[PDB]
Amino acid sequence: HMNKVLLLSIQNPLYPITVDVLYTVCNPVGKVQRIVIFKRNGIQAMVEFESVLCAQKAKAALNGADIYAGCCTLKIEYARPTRLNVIRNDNDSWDYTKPYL
């Protein structure tokens, strides 16, 4: 179901996957509000965008792309949660409306 939260699966994650990397990946194509990175079906992340349109733009532009040449291939689907909540801003979760510390 279309939604403003995307679920990213990072195939062949040869390099670190942190919120700063995913912000530089996603935000130029769709405005990001929150990012949560976790391990489940491999290295995965949910990214909450400002709107459904912004999430659709990010999904269209990034699905199947590699973050870095030859690795870190993105598989993107709509996430189940309609919103994300970030406990703290660190390397694995970030709310871009709120300060570090």
């Binding site: 390099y15 670190p16 990397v21 530089t24 990946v25 532009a61 990034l62 699905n63 199947g64 792309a65 590699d66 973050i67 870095y68 040449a69």
Partner: peptide, 12 residues
């Protein structure tokens, strides 16, 4: 797969 071969960032 229209983004096959797309690369987003310089390698670290």
């Amino acid at each position: 797969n229209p983004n096959a071969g797309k690369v987003l960032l310089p390698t670290p």
